[PDB]
């Protein structure tokens, strides 16, 4: 259970009861004039908990920009060998929706002892309440991007400062697999022998 707050994300690895339509409710306390977050609109029970952690907020704003950034935010989640590691990034994007041609390098945030297999999930939300107008819900608009990982061999080009720009998949096309043989992003004019192929049995 990853919960971002105003401002201490309290990562949680526990045993919960997640509702049929889980998401974080947000309301107005009237005491100290602060917008709290009701966290049990996500899940009813919190008990048995195995792990807990807190860090500086992964989700972060900048704004003042009237757009032209959109603050494109990416998070990679990979669960292996007892370490489920989180990755992040923040990028400006001027395009209406979809992604540019640029490379996005994601550093590992925390490498945590998770030890559980995660086969399924859903995201979380922040909504609020409104008052009499012709209850209020679905603040603004929400959309995001999801894709699944896969084992692949990449050639990684670090920079003088170690900032990876160009990465190339080997299996992407018969052309991409040869660049992994020369290890170079420059491919000199000529013929190169990429890995062999076999006909397979019916």
């Amino acid at each position, epitope marked *: 259970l990853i919960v971002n707050n105003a401002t201490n994300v309290v990562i949680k690895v526990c045993e919960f009861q997640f509702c049929n339509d889980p998401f974080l409710g947000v309301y*107005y306390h*009237k005491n100290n004039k602060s917008w709290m977050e*009701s966290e049990f609109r996500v899940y009813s029970s919190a008990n048995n908990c195995t792990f807990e952690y807190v860090s500086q907020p992964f989700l972060m704003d900048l704004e003042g920009k009237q757009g032209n950034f959109k603050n494109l935010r990416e998070f990679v989640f990979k669960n292996i060998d007892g370490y489920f590691k989180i990755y992040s990034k923040h990028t400006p994007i001027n395009l209406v929706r979809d992604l540019p041609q640029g490379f996005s390098a994601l550093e590992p945030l925390v490498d945590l002892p998770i030890g559980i297999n995660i086969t399924r999930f859903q995201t979380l939300l922040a909504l609020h309440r409104s*008052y009499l107008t012709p209850s209020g819900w679905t603040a603004g608009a929400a959309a995001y991007y999801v894709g699944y990982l896969q084992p692949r061999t990449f050639l990684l080009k670090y920079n003088e400062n170690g900032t990876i720009t160009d990465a190339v998949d080997c299996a992407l096309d018969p052309l991409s697999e040869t660049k992994c043989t020369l290890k170079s992003f420059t491919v000199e004019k000529g013929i190169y022998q990429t890995s062999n192929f076999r006909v397979q049995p019916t």
Partner: antibody
Amino acid sequence: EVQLLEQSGAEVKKPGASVRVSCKVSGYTLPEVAMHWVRQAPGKGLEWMGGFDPEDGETMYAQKFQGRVTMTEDTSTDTAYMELSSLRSEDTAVYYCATTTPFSSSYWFDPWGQGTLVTV
Amino acid sequence: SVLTQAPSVSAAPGQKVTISCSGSSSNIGNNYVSWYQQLPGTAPKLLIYDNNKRPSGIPDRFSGSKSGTSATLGITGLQTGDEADYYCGTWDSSLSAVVFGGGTKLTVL
């Protein structure tokens, strides 16, 4: 949107008593929205009472009736108790649970509590 | 209470006639006005808020206006079920509270 719970129920208290009024809600949580109270005497008009102040954050008390009636709040159980004291002649009447919205300037009392008469 | 409106008013059905409430600058002048309806022994229902705004479920046939210290509640398309008392209110900074008028019980003739 929202329906409420009743204001009291039927509370009949002979002279020499005093009565709390516990108004609960449904579909909202208690301290996202402010309550209010109005005296309504049958065959008569409205007299506002109790109430919360969007400004200054205080829970208001009608100056005319100030000090005789008090209010407390239990946020989780949504129970807001209106205790009126020192029964008098004309003070038996329907006292409505009403609500405004902390955002922002709302004077209007919004879905309300069906009414409860008291007894002196 | 501290405001001005008559006990009762009467008109023929299906007609167009309104009801007004006379306040002061200390009450209606700087503040927004609301209007309420109650049937005998029933739950007083919000009619119009800020005099220009209809709550959910209100016939559009109702309107409102604020001229100086005077606030009229637009009442049109009279119905046989429209007989009831209408109450004016607006925020008061004088006693710093909520005020109302005595109420005006309409009668559809």
